[PDB]
Amino acid sequence: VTAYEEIVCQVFAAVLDRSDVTADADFFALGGHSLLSLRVVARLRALLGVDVGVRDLFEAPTPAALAARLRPAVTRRGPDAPPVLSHFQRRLWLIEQVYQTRGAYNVPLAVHVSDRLDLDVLRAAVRDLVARHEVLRTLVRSSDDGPDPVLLAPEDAAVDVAEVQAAGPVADLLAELTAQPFDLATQIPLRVRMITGEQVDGCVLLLVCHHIAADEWSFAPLLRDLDTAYRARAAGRAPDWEPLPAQYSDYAATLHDWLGEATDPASPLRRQLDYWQHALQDLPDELDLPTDRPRPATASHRGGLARAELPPELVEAVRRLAAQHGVTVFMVVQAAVAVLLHRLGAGDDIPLGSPVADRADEAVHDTVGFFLNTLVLRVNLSGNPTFADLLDRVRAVDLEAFARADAPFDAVVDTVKPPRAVSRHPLFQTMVSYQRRPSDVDRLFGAATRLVEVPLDTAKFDLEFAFIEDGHGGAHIALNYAADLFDHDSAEQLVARLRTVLEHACADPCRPV
Ligand SMILES: *P(=O)(O)OCC(C)(C)[C@@H](O)C(=O)NCCC(=O)NCCS
């Protein structure tokens, strides 16, 4: 859960009165001492629901370490260790068997490069990347028991690297290349394309992963390692690499041993599932949302992307509102989405799905893989509260949920047993997420680089609101909507209405919702 990490940073900043806190910034090296250390733990006791003392601060002086401190550590298995599929990977494989996703679970990463890269050096660098990260060369094959992992040896992993020439606009070409399907039984879950043409200055480098091998937090290590391997291979050498503290299979094995069996009443899995069964009792099948078309018989996973720019002064005001009320920026956005759906007539019981990263362990905090569980965050709006009251409700709901974040979403579904439809995501149909793009990726491959956004043609749910921060200060709200249900202009209006809710909440949070 990254939310613990963000509030620790928030408290460090308020007590040291700085603007310098990263996840690895040492509290004592930052000018903190024991007198202020008690102010930090006193504030953390009030925000988080947990006992914290100077003891914890001493042994875990950074936000990332303190967050993880508040289950065994990942251990490296032997060189002959077989691959292990996490429950995350099994669920994603299962989705691709039930549905025709049309690439909805591919994730793009596109980088504008001022110089055209060398294709032979790039292909060699991708081989180094795939050799380093076993998850990038692990196939999934169907057997009578179910899906089984197949780890390709580095010499046997055929990388897919090619140059493509843009005829029309590159933006639509990026989305087209991104949506191409992976055969997970025969192709490694990574595709690399270098887009060139006379309308593009330099090239656009597009990495496409299937989510089975990468979440959005993998962007930074993917770019960092690809950059290291490219510059090394351009000088004619293999990269000088400190080996990985853990492979994805190590994390999956450690996690599954700890989780246990759902039939074991003492297992963490059963105990967390029992929390969710009670927390999701009498859950609505779906929310009454204003759509343009009824739910079709079959889900097409077609979608679009409506964007709402946020002025830097509004981004700052949302940050200050969160700090003043002791919540994260995500919690403010989550409350705003709940207000929005409430005002649209969805009722007082608003369940919103949200991805939570299981990256607290040092050995996986900055590695490549899929670590996102989906939690159902159930917001109650009865008794017409103020926005400040709602922020208190949302913090309570989120913190109780984050303490049971390891229950796999598919097990929670099978525990809650909701009425199921192939055209409707179970338990929730609106997702809210907070994302931060990599920083310091502006000078990769010895050139000038900048991330470029890919316009999705797909959607996973009815609605996904994302507060997305770029690596350099700015922020915007992206609404990924199901085209089956919503026209583009209705989505543009929805995301504009969310911005208006945020503006009103910052201006005066003491007004009822
Ligand atoms: P804080 O760490 O800034 O300041 C406390 C102190 C360094 C001034 C010091 O006087 C102190 O903590 N002494 C207590 C340490 C101690 O005796 N440990 C208990 C285990 S025997």
Author numbering: 2481 to 2550, 2557 to 2999
Lines quoted from the article behind this entry:
In the PCP2-C3 didomain structure, the PCP2 domain sits at the acceptor-PCP binding site (near the opening of the acceptor substrate channel) on the C3 domain from the second chain in the asymmetric unit. The interface between the PCP2 domain and C3 domain is mostly hydrophobic in nature (537/510 Å2 buried surface area (chain A/B) excluding PPant), with the side chains of V2534, L2515, L2518, F2508, and F2538 of the PCP domain playing a major role in the interaction along with residues A2907, V2908, V2584, L2580, and W2579 of the C domain. We were surprised, therefore, to find that this construct crystallized with the PCP2 domain positioned at the acceptor-PCP binding site of the C3 domain of the second chain in the asymmetric unit. Mass spectrometric analysis of the PCP2-C3 didomain construct revealed a 340 Dalton mass increase, consistent with attachment of PPant to S2514, likely installed by the phosphopantetheinyl transferase EntD that phosphopantetheinylates some PCP domains when they are expressed in E. coli. Interestingly, we found that this did not extend into the active site of the C domain, but instead curled back towards the outer surface of the C domain. The side chain of R2577 appears to block the channel that leads to the active site of the C domain. Access of the PPant arm to the C domain active site appears to be gated by R2577, which repels the unmodified PPant arm (or neutral/negatively charged substrates) in favor of the aminoacyl-PPant.
Non-ribosomal peptide synthetases are important enzymes for the assembly of complex peptide natural products. Within these multi-modular assembly lines, condensation domains perform the central function of chain assembly, typically by forming a peptide bond between two peptidyl carrier protein (PCP)-bound substrates. To address this, we report the structure and biochemical characterization of complexes of a PCP domain bearing a stable analog of the acyl acceptor complexed to the acceptor site of a C domain from the NRPS that biosynthesizes fuscachelin in the thermophile Thermobifida fusca. The C3 domain of the didomain resembles other members of its class, comprising a pseudo-dimer of CAT domains with bridge (R2923 to T2944) and floor loop (A2843 to L2858) regions.
